[PDB]
Amino acid sequence: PRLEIHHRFKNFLRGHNVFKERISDMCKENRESLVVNYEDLAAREHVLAYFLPEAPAELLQIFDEAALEVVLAMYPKYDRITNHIHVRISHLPLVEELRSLRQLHLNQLIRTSGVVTSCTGVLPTIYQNYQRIRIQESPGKVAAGRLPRSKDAILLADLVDSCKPGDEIELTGIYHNNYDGSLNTANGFPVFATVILANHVAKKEDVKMITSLSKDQQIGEKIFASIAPSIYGHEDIKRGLALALFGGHKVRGDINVLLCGDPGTAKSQFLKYIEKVSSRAIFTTGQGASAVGLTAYVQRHPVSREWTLEAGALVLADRGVCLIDEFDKMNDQDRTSIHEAMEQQSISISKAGIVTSLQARCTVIAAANPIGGRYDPSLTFSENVDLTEPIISRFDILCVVRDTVDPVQDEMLARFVVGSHVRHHPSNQEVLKKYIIYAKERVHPKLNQMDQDKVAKMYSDLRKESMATGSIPITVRHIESMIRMAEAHARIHLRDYVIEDDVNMAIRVMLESFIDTQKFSVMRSMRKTFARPEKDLVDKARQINIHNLSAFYDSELFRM
């Protein structure tokens, strides 16, 4: 439209102290970074600053040509660094937090955010120029309940191998609908019908007011007497929920919370209420879940289409929490693939020829569904299973239901339903939600060297007691979960001791487990407890209370 700026800027192709050092920042080391502030762009040439929201498109062609001019003139040796320069303009105010999800605003620079999920190095000439990646934008929220339009980005061999999972980065660009499928020989994009190019990937308050109330002990007393107000459930469930809420080097762990009811009762739907508090909850329902249900599958593809890299919700909740529903209703075929990944929460190959890692570090929360009746058959529960041992043995705790016919307890739930229906009919608190969630990020206590033995001493005594009358009938693996469970206790109170009130409650956990595995004759042998060579080497470590097996001459490990 105008003429004064176009020719001058085209002839350009024919606070600055930071720029002076930043232009030389790239070197043979190949740090592969380019950080440019947007405010400097308006500062150096102000005529462009007004043209940025009008005609940003021509800048893309100019930027690639302009970069070579300066570099080639200085030192031709630097030419062999990635053989590419990427435009990395910073943000351009405006900012759409929720209204950006519109197809009406095409041909405009768009500011957004996203996370790199996976890389396609492990996968095998027109189609070879580009690859396929699975990207989401909408996070888990109550308002985000309506299903959004998923993004499918295309890598044109530029950001391959340079992207790593876990980068909370921001995406900026223009959505041109340059639909390359005009030859009608491929598939197509969802409702947001536009080809999405990648231009920005980084490489290297009410919180305070609530935090003031967090340390307060006045609210710290009633907090564990309001944890489960929806149905009041059972005392064991609240413990599992509280542990799941906190979700707590190789300092990792997994929690297996078990429920014993039936699907018809909302007990099966009790896990639905977690998404109100949880940040990342996806319902699988079993077979035919939403896109990829954490399981990898292969389909037959036409002549020219891309094989699918399966991105589970496991990747999307890195250092997060992932919720799984109806775990036992999944297909037998899916079990075979998922059995190996669950063991290591990743894919690890140590052949020294092919190496890769895919992160999956959410807290696996799933509920088992009893097959048919609870204990109607008269045969053994454990000894009458044709299934494979290692998959079943993923459950740390096997809780059994207590009491069968309690009308008084059942009486309360019915009135809750009746009262609930009253409120919904016409008639003419985020402060508490974030209290527990925020705590798990700030509390990181330290350990005392002279008291580390005493902590581990107590539990070791309980193990050797069970070896008097028996033949190795207790496994350390069950204990292995118990030690991490006590961890949240110190994270909550930071009182340096454990009260005897909590001790009685944790006892009820173990007694339920013995009920299910042992025949009902447990009423005769275990009365007193109830009424009142690689693996061998692991037991040896507990006698000295040293986890590290390479603690001898650790001074030479630091040198390496």
Binding site: V298, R300, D332, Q333, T336
Partner: protein
């Protein structure tokens, strides 16, 4: 019938046989001039 091409692949996976096997046998028995290969040549030439 009922053992068509879209389901025979999954049977190998059910037998703990990955996609490597299907090329070695399934993709090679039809090139042998099997009746099943000729069945697709005549019945499914336009019916698909």
């Amino acid at each position: 019938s009922q053992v068509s091409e879209h389901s025979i692949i999954k049977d190998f996976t059910k037998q703990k046989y990955p996609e490597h096997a299907i090329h070695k046998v399934l993709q090679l028995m039809l090139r042998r001039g099997e009746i099943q290969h000729r069945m697709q040549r005549k019945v499914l030439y336009r019916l698909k």
